[PDB]
Amino acid sequence: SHGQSCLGCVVLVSVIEQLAEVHNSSVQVAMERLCSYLPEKLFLKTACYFLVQTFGSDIIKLLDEAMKADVVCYALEFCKRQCHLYPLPQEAWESALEKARQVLRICSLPFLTKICQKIELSIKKAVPFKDVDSDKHSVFPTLRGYHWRGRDCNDSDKTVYPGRRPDNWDIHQDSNCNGIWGIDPKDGIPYEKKFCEGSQPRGIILLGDAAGAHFHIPPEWLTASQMSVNSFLNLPSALTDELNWPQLSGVTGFLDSTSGIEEKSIYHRLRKRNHCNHRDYQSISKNGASSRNLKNFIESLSRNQASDHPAIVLYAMIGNDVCNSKADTVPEMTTPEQMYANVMQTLTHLNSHLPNGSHVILYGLPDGTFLWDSLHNRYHPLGQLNKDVTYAQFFSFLRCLQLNPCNGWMSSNKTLRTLTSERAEQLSNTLKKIATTETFANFDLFYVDFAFHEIIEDWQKRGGQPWQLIEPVDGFHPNEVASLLQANRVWEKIQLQWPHVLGKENPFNSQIEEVFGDQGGH
Ligand SMILES: *[C@@H]1O[C@H](CO)[C@@H](O)[C@H](O)[C@H]1NC(C)=O
Ligand SMILES: [Ca+2]
Ligand SMILES: [Ca+2]
Ligand SMILES: [Ca+2]
């Protein structure tokens, strides 16, 4: 477990060294300035001052000796036997380390132990931590809260959750938190059935991985040049969301896009098309999710076979079947045979858990050689200041720490990059053939490929560069923009060939807009 600590240490000491340079300050002044930017929420600002108190004196002497973060953290025993992040010949590596020895020479608390043990299960099971009625929908934003699924309007009632069939069409209280309830004043007719009946409502559900949940570390947290108090305001919400931003993803996103592009999420297209689908979105996605381990949390899916509407399900395991952290990485890659066996088991679980009239769309896997081609000679946020860390050096560093999320594509071995894409193609064809030659009772099966090159063409006509489609910090996942151009590219395709999956526009939208408006928001 030295990798995660070693990485974290090098990240922090890097920020420290760089904040000192940006402001022409001392190492002490930088550490005080760093904590100054962090918020108090979740005790982050307290932990900062503690670490400065515990390690500050040692860090100041080492950085004053021109040592870089990687050497510092190996001297401070945060990195254990070496992995270079900055260029340095091994002879120069030994001297600096031997010079650091002559200079220098959590949840266990009984009162905090159990809540730690309680938080662990809620996340690991992919269920909201704040959920009194245990309907898996929450009134809280993060901790698997309503950022991932529609917010719960009645947290006390375990029969009230988005996607539920109208219970007597909500004469007295909103049954599915979709913002429509009550009766028509003129005629005494329930608002719900008046508006939403016969429209064939359908929900959007995501079975995906980190990319599906829009994993995103803001580069602002790592670029000292533009750091401020406003850089870390969203840090507490991010940590409690597992560094995921599903509210902004391309599938289950419901917030306005910061990126500025006009494309909207599938859920937004879904809700826009039929105001009854309001809040009928679910993000059943976890970091590291693959065809092998989806079963370990697919139970978090909340959809009752009898009391809920149909659903549009997207199976989006877009890499972890080829992307792994092992040194001998190819053996860990899922084979087409294992891919077939794992998906069929996953589909079988859905036919037993999804109401009839549902639809499942299998995503293909993209050609991840795009990662190295676009980024290998560009500078990681931690290297942008002094232009001393390229994504190539960043991939090698992570590889050394056994932390590289995709040894197959985030690699300088072209032969392996090709080998990894070939496997990604073979797995995509398996998903294609399944949708064609496999039939199920409660839903039909379709396949749309990723086709990253198509999204790049759409991006280049817009005046953008391909490297602007990848998360800057990890250089691996697609960013908010790429996710939306994909969701758009997917939505258009299903429309042109399988419009019944999405349905057809409900003409009461305007009549629902006229009467209810925002419908309680999200
Ligand atoms: C590149 O990857 C291939 C496939 O795993 C392997 O056979 C080859 O030895 C690798 N080359 C180097 C220089 O590691
Ligand atoms: Ca609830
Ligand atoms: Ca409820
Ligand atoms: Ca309702």
Kindly identify the ligand whose nearest atom is closest to the C-alpha of 328. Answer: 1
Query: Which one of the ligands is nearest to 157 CA?
Result: 3
Determine the residue type at 280: D
Token pair of 42 as six digits: 């979740």
CB 450 within 8 A of CB 318: yes
SS3 track for 200-241: CCCEEEEEECCCCCCCCCCHHHCCHHHCCHHHHCCHHHHHCC
362 phi and psi, to 5 degrees?
-95, 125
Please name the residue whose Cα sits nearest to atom 14 of ligand 1: 413
Residue 427: C-alpha distances to residues 335, 434, 436, 452, 467 (Å): 7, 11, 15, 16, 25
Q: Pick from 469, 326, 321, 466: which is nearest to 398 by CA?
A: 326
Phi and psi angles of residue 15, each rounded to the nearest 5 degrees, phi first? -50, -45
- 3-class DSSP state for residue 183? strand
Q: Which residues sit with their C-beta closer than 6 Å to ligand 1?
A: 330, 413, 415-416, 419
CA dihedral 286→290→291→292, nearest 10 degrees, is -100
Strands 443-448 vs 311-316: parallel, antiparallel or unpaired: unpaired
Q: Which technique was the structure solved with, according to the deposited record? A: X-ray
Contact 50, 12 (CB under 8 A): no
Ligand 4 centroid to 318 CA: how many Å? 35
Helices (H), 360-400: 369-375, 381-384, 391-400
Contact between residue 373 and residue 467 where contact means Cβ atoms under 8 Å apart: no
How far apart, in whole angstroms, are the C-alpha atoms of residue 383 and residue 224?
11
Closest ligand 1 atom to Cα of 329:
5
Residue type, 15: V
The secondary element (H helix, E strand) that includes residue 448 is strand 443-448
Helix-helix angle 480-497:452-461, to 10 degrees: 110
* Residue to probe by mutation, ligand 1, list 416, 417, 422, most atoms within 8 Å of CB: 416
- How far does the centroid of ligand 1 lie from the alpha carbon of residue 322, in Å? 16
Distance CA 300, CA 245 (A): 18
Structural Rg of the chain based on CA atoms: 25
**Atom 13, ligand 1: which residue's CA is nearest?**
413
Pairing of strands 311-316, 281-285: unpaired
Instruction: Using CB atoms within 10 Å of the CB of residue 328, give its burial: 0 to 12 exposed, 13 to 18 middle, 19+ buried.
Output: exposed
Resolution of the coordinates in A?
Answer: 2.8
Q: CA angle, corner 101, sides to 99 and 103, nearest 5? A: 75
Q: List Cα–Cα distances, 355 to 115, 157, 302, 351, in angstroms.
A: 36, 22, 12, 8
Q: Taking Cα atoms as reference points, which of 70, 64, 71 lies closest to residue 31? A: 64
Of the candidates 210, 391, 405, which has an alpha carbon nearest to the alpha carbon of residue 322?
405
Residue nearest to atom 4 of ligand 1 (CA): 416
> Residues of 117-128 as b/e, b for ≥16 C-beta within 10 angstroms?
eeeeebbebbbb
Question: Do residues 319 and 368 touch, judged by C-beta distance below 8 A?
Answer: yes
Tally the C-alpha atoms within 13 A of residue 256's C-alpha that lie toward its C-beta. Answer: 2
List, in order, residues 6 or more apart from 471 with CB less than 8 Å away.
Answer: 215, 216, 217, 477, 478, 479
CA separation for the pair 201, 178 (Å, rounded):
12
DSSP codes of every residue in 457-518: HHHHHTT--GGGGB-TTTSSSB-HHHHHHHHHHHHHHHHHH-HHHH----TTHHHHHHHHTT
How far apart are alpha carbons 455 and 459 in whole angstroms?
Answer: 6
- Residues, Cβ < 5 Å to ion ligand 2: 131, 133, 135, 137, 152, 155
- Strand partners of residue 358: 443
Q: 336 and 374 in contact (C-beta within 8 Å)?
A: no
CA atoms within 13 A on the CB side of 53: 6
In CATH, 243-502 is 3.30.160: no
Strand order in the sheet with 311-316: 281-285, 203-208, 311-316, 358-363, 443-448
* Sequence-separated (6 or more) residues with CB below 8 Å from residue 261: 481, 484, 485
Q: Measured in angstroms, how far is the CA atom of residue 309 from the centroid of ligand 3?
A: 16
Ligand 1 atom closest to Cα of residue 416 = 2
Residue nearest to atom 11 of ligand 1 (CA): 413
d(CA 315, CA 502): 16
What SS3 class is residue 270? Answer: helix
Chain centre to alpha carbon of residue 322: 18
Q: How far is it, in rounded angstroms, from Cα 387 to Cα 316?
A: 35
Domain range annotation of the chain: 2-104, 243-502
CA–CA gap between residue 445 and residue 423 (Å, rounded): 22
* Beta-carbon-side half-sphere exposure of residue 453 (alpha carbons within 13 Å): 2
Domain 243-502 in the same topology as domain 2-104: no
Return d(Cα 375, Cα 200) in angstroms, integer.
Answer: 45
Contact call for residues 470 and 476 (beta carbons, < 8 A): yes
* d(CA 169, ligand 4 centre) in Å: 7
The rounded Å distance from CA 158 to ligand 3 centre is 4
Q: Which residues contact 331 (CB under 8 A, 6 or more apart)?
A: none
274 Cα–ligand 4 center, Å: 13
Question: Across-strand partners of 456?
Answer: none
Assign domain 2-104 to a CATH class. mainly alpha
**Which has the closest alpha carbon to 359: 314, 309, 306, 307?**
314
Ligand 1 atom, smallest distance to 419 CA = 4
CA angle 448, 452, 458 (to 5 degrees): 105
**Burial state string for 452-490 with b = 16 or more CB within 10 A and e = fewer than 16:** beebbebbeeeeeebbebbbbbbbbbbbbbbbbbbbbbb
Q: Are the C-beta atoms of 35 and 229 separated by less than 8 Å?
A: no
SS3 assignment, position 355:
coil
Distance from Cα 317 to the centre of ligand 3, integer Å: 30
